Design a protein around this ligand. Structure first.
Ligand code: HEM
Length: 464
């Protein structure tokens, strides 16, 4: 009949004094040790119910999916989105935009041979670019993001960016900068005090300029499409949305208008780029750290695929080890540690607790990815967490990097195809040489807040 228990908050600052903005995950897990897997925390004035561990998260987001299907907030992103767009919208707006987005993504090849061919082709471009380095030590950050970003870019903008495109690099920097900021102490402090901070000088202002930069770019691309639009022959996601907008012009209450187009497109562009990119980057670092794992991956690739042909998505079924490795990378990486906030759609009764309608919820995906009840050694990187005795792939109900439930990631299909084809093709063609000794490679995160960011590093890609 009452909300989950938790530390007594103070007016306005909430539980700020009982938290550490540089390590929110750790702070909440600590409080969790005292109040239990389901507790209440006050992030500044924001009252939030925190769900820790697999059971609590699944019970809420899956067993009571409709009740927890609301979209919470992320102050930094809300600065530009203001509740528009598929990701941060709620109610009728979210229902229309999500349905349309999923359909439009599929119409443009997502989950089909079309997008697979697009990915294989861009993968071929990654290979060329890596060979272009001549085995020199480099920062793989943008090599990876350019390739990844061109996949979702092909869908939303009609086609790919040239790797030499300076505005392209510029946009990628904006995305990287935003994910970093939201994962820093100030970024997490902003989640608590955005009401005042959005108006104060500080790092947040610089972050805002990056978002503004992305919005301007999108608004620009949309204008260009508008003035070259063939109502019966859409080239991309944008044209599709524009056509829908024309069809809905006479509906006072349609959700299909310019702001939702711009924001939805911006969200998919960022969503489809930085998440996959960060994962690839963390993955290669993890493989250099564990030579024994790269060795096995090479054995499976050579046997199953060989050295001549391009790997294809169907090869995954014949490659249990690679599938286990990518899973372990996503589990260890814990890219979106606290997921994207949800909120109860209406008054809810959850585990003998009462959550009034509108209550914000923090599904601690990281605590699920490292639930000691589902993984033998959660803190270690070990592909075995995903293999049975005969070395066959073993799924886990605790594997939730894309979250679960009604507002789960609908980019998962695309993401998985990308992770498999990029990782495999790169490993088929190169062995990884780290700038330092494996024993010395630090795989602990550089930042953890909204996202998990790996430490900066360099490496070389040596031909096989
Ligand atoms: C390895 C890559 C990715 C990870 C780890 C990931 C993770 C997430 C997570 C944790 C959520 C929130 C789920 C929830 O609220 O329950 C989410 C939502 C979302 N993701 Fe992803 N994602 C990835 C890639 C993608 C890609 C490639 C796209 C783009 C096609 C994308 C599109 C979205 C969208 C549009 C949402 C919002 C859905 C809604 O509000 O209904 N994601 N993602």
């Amino acid at each position: 009949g009452k909300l989950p228990p938790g530390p007594t908050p103070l007016p306005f600052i909430g539980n700020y004094l009982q938290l550490n903005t540089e390590q929110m995950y750790n702070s909440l897990m600590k409080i969790s040790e005292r109040y239990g897997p389901v507790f209440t925390i006050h992030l500044g004035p924001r009252r939030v119910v925190v769900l820790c561990g697999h059971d609590a998260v699944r019970e809420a987001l899956v067993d009571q999916a409709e009740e927890f299907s609301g979209r919470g907030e992320q102050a930094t992103f809300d600065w530009v989105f203001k509740g528009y767009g598929v990701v941060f919208s709620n109610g009728e707006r979210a229902k229309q935009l999500r349905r349309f987005s999923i359909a439009t993504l599929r119409d443009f090849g997502v989950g089909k041979r079309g997008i697979e061919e697009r990915i294989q082709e861009e993968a071929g471009f990654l290979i060329d670019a890596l060979r272009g380095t001549g085995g020199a030590n480099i920062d793989p950050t943008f090599f990876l993001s350019r390739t990844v970003s061109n996949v979702i870019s092909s869908i939303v903008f009609g086609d790919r960016f040239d790797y030499k495109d300076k505005e392209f690099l510029s946009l990628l920097r904006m995305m990287l900068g935003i994910f970093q900021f939201t994962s820093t102490s100030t970024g997490q402090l902003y989640e608590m005090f955005s009401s005042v901070m959005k108006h104060l000088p500080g790092p947040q202002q610089q972050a805002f300029q990056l978002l503004q930069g992305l919005e301007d770019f999108i608004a620009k691309k949309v204008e260009h499409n508008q003035r070259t639009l063939d109502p019966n022959s859409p080239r991309d996601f944008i044209d599709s949305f524009l056509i829908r907008m024309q069809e809905e012009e006479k509906n006072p209450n349609t959700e299909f208008y310019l702001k939702n187009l711009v924001m939805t497109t911006l969200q998919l562009f960022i969503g489809g780029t930085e998440t996959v990119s960060t994962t690839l980057r963390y993955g290669f670092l993890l493989l250099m750290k564990h030579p024994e794992v790269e060795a096995k991956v090479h054995e499976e690739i050579d046997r199953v695929i060989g050295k001549n042909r391009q790997p294809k998505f169907e090869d995954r079924a014949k490659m249990p080890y690679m599938e286990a490795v990518i899973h372990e990378i996503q589990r260890f990486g814990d890219v979106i540690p606290m997921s994207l906030a949800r909120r109860v759609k209406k008054d809810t009764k959850f585990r003998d607790f009462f959550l009034p309608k509108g209550t914000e919820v923090y599904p601690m995906l990281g605590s699920v990815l490292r639930d000691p009840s589902f993984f033998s050694n959660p803190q270690d990187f070990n592909p075995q967490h995903f293999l049975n005795e005969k070395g066959q792939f073993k799924k886990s109900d605790a594997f939730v990097p894309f979250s679960i439930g009604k507002r789960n990631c609908f980019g998962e299909g695309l993401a998985r195809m990308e992770l498999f084809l990029f990782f495999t093709t790169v490993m088929q063609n190169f062995r990884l040489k780290s700038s330092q000794s494996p024993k010395d490679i630090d795989v602990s995160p550089k930042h953890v807040g909204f996202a998990t960011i790996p430490r900066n590093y360099t490496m070389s890609f040596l031909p096989r």
